Amino acid sequence: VAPASCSEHRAECERLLTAEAFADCQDLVPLEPYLRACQQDRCRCPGGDTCVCSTVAEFSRQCSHAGGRPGNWRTATLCPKTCPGNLVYLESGSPC
Amino acid sequence: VAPASCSEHRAECERLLTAEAFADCQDLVPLEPYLRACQQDRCRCPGGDTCVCSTVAEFSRQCSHAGGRPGNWRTATLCPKTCPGNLVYLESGSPC
């Protein structure tokens, strides 16, 4: 059944996606599709934020693949990740 | 005591203020000062939205005074206003 257009969470998605760490990709990748995707993601996925931060991850991957370099956005309260030792989770660093 | 910078609601103020109704005044009046004021208003006035819709009212008054004509933004759930009879509330209409 056609659910309501989840436009009540548009501000949250726009604020989260268009942060400082995503500066040098605003001209590489568009924005409308990825935020429209966040629209349904936010309402279709109540409770834990395991379903919204999986889009901005795709936005960052597209950012990195085009040629840009994003900053760090994952905080201890925004879908953090853990690795053993003092290894630091980052974006846009050489795998070598 | 100096309170925390109420930047956690910056997205809310930015979204609500930069709507389509305020189209032809983005070039007349600045944006930073009024949004900065909205920052404290949103966090210093919990519960009812009697402080947030007092700043955008000033933004609209400036929009109209400079020469622009803003659109309607007051909805039935966004600080509505009532007048007796079928007196419709509007912005930028002649008092004559």
What's the CA dihedral at B22, B28, B33, B34 to 10 degrees? -30
Tokens of B92: 């930028």
Candidates B77, B76, B43, B74; CA nearest to B56 is B74
| Method used experimentally | cryo-EM
All residues of chain B having their beta carbon less than 8 Å from the beta carbon of residue A11 are: 11-12, 14-16
Residues 6 or more apart whose CB falls under 8 angstroms from that of B23 comprise B70, B71
Q: Do B11 and A12 touch (CB under 8 A)?
A: yes
Nearest chain B residue to A18, by CA? B11
Nearest chain B residue to A12, by CA? B11
- Model resolution, angstroms: 3.8
Looking at residue A42, the DSSP 8-state letter turns out to be H
